[PDB]
A paper describes a structure:
Two of the main force transduction components are talin and vinculin. As forces increase in FAs, vinculin moves away from the membrane towards the force transduction and actin rich layers in a myosin II dependent manner. Here we demonstrate that paxillin can act as an adaptor protein to connect FAK with the force transduction component vinculin.
Diffraction of optimized crystals resulted in a crystal structure at a resolution of 2.55 Å. In the final structure, the asymmetric unit contains four Vin-T molecules and each two LD1 and LD2 peptides, which are well defined in the electron density maps. There are three different Vin-T:LD interactions observed in the crystal structure, one involving LD1 and two LD2, each is present twice due to the non-crystallographic symmetry.
Residue numbers in the entry:
A (entry chain G), H (entry chain H): 1 to 13
B (entry chain E): 140 to 156
C (entry chain B): 888 to 1046, 1055 to 1060
D (entry chain A), E (entry chain C): 892 to 1066
F (entry chain F): 140 to 155
G (entry chain D): 889 to 1047, 1054 to 1060
The structure:
């Protein structure tokens, strides 16, 4: 749960 | 968390260069 | 004993074929080479994306669009090279290869959409799925070959661009 | 051989966060990998040995060189990042790194001088080692998070970009 | 994902022999790594699938271009060797390679055309695979020993060396 | 047989 | 765990020299060539001083090689000093490179020592440690003396000439 | 094995 995690979750949902 | 292959691909793809 | 990746191999091979050709040359003053490298990578991604996963449907669309933009660049540049060339054979052969790219690129996109639509979808037959991949791979391969040979034809016309190792 | 485990584990963790990326057009990733290698070495130097005093100090200086590099490169990418949150969280984490590496150099010069002497107690020897590990774990954790935030900041770069890193995976042998 | 195990296994054995050496100033190793990759690719292509026919033909071609590379280079190192036994054994192994890769292309075009088709029976299809794997194994194995011999050859060079390869281990990430 | 780290270093040292 | 059974300080010294010489092209620069071979030789030393089958004799060899290469660096650095017309730079160069023959000769002598007492029971830990200590120290001084010769060579190569393209 | 092993054995015995 960092900025990178957040952006990947956005791109996968 | 740690990145998968599919993760790192979407990063690569989206990464502006 | 493990496959290693979950990819369509033919599409990856096509990517690498063009990468091998583009790799040789510098990009410092050669946008066709730069564009080729971009497309090579873009294609390498497609080979993974067409196998599916969370975020692939959309990324397969976006990947396709990028490929088509770079297709434009290659074509536009190749044409400018054909203009300066003062050889009947090389100039003609160049235009025969590079003019095919816009068409192949558009068909790619179209089929890229079709596949992206039917990823993670139960109401799609094996037949229809197989053929959709088949059509997609056939244009993917054609594109890589077209671009590859467009790169080669450019340097044969090169008397401007930079063709240093 | 008996190395310092926590520092090897840190070295190893940072290496995992950088190893799958290419160093071509990405001096942040290159700096990361260099720092990971250097912490691996430090992990072996700390237990003492022939030529360790001198090697340990020089090692610390090297990590401090690569640190200042990751810092400054992180401040550039942050300059081009249009998302303020990511630009804030990268600036926080990266601007921490110079202070830690400086303390690393200090503590490394400390441990280096204790190696060999008999006038040092076991309490003071162990504690000096603990301090060194503490700063090591933090440095490696900071850089690790500085890397990720750079990967996040790379997506949100302004189209009129001054500075941009390359983010391309490494091709395996069986591709 | 299902692949042909022997071909991948053979691909891995060639890679293991080459992977620890640097490709810089050594085209035998560079080509030995390319051929391992190509074999790994071929292990996937023999399973049928979309775009297989063309890729499997173009693959065998790329394995033939790499074969010739290895062979030619191994003759030049052999030319410079002062040991006759090593010189003979190297030539014996490497001079068989061209034939083998020529057969590999022939059988690849065979298997390529067999894919998709119904009229082709099981035995005919299975036998076409077993012929392809047999030769593939022999190619990888021949190339594998050719590297070993070329390493040996590179020790017993004449001091007036015309041609020479660079034999240097790759540095580990933790060195 | 298969080479070890030492086996490779000697090769490396001995190869001109 | 560890990764390698080596003497880490000597690997560092090797890598320090390799980082210096790697910047420049060898093509028209024998100093760089020699330097790169010295770093690799000194890297191999950092494994041989641990021991195992074949090491005693390789450590002798490796040391001789380092000595050969060292002399080349010295001879070349002298020629560079002859051309240079700047007092400080030509002096500071000569104050570094002329140490290398000595440091080398000591490295051979100590290498022979440590090679002799590898795989040998009649040798105390104190004697064994002190042999390794003098070896590493000379090995570190060598790499440093070379590294600074390379730097002083280019600073003097304002113009026998050399090539300093990255 | 072959010639490469024979040379490694030579250097280690």
């Amino acid at each position: 749960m960092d900025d990178l995690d957040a952006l990947l979750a956005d791109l996968e949902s | 968390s740690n990145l998968s292959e599919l993760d790192r691909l979407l990063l690569e793809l989206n990464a502006v260069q | 004993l493990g496959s290693g990746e979950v990819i369509n191999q033919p599409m990856m091979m096509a990517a690498r074929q063009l990468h091998d050709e583009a790799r040789k040359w510098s990009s410092k003053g050669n946008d066709i080479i730069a564009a080729a490298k971009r497309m090579a990578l873009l294609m390498a991604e497609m080979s993974r994306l067409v196998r599916g996963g969370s975020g692939t449907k959309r990324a397969l669309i976006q990947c396709a669009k990028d490929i088509a933009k770079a297709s434009d660049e290659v074509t536009r540049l190749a044409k400018e090279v054909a203009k300066q060339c003062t050889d009947k054979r090389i100039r003609t052969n160049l235009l025969q290869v590079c003019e095919r790219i816009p068409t192949i690129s558009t068909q790619l996109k179209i089929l890229s959409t079709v596949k992206a639509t039917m990823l993670g979808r139960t109401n799609i037959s094996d037949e229809e799925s197989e053929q959709a991949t088949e059509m997609l791979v056939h244009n993917a391969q054609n594109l890589m070959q077209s671009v590859k040979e467009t790169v080669r034809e450019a340097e044969a016309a090169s008397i401007t661009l930079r063709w240093v190792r």
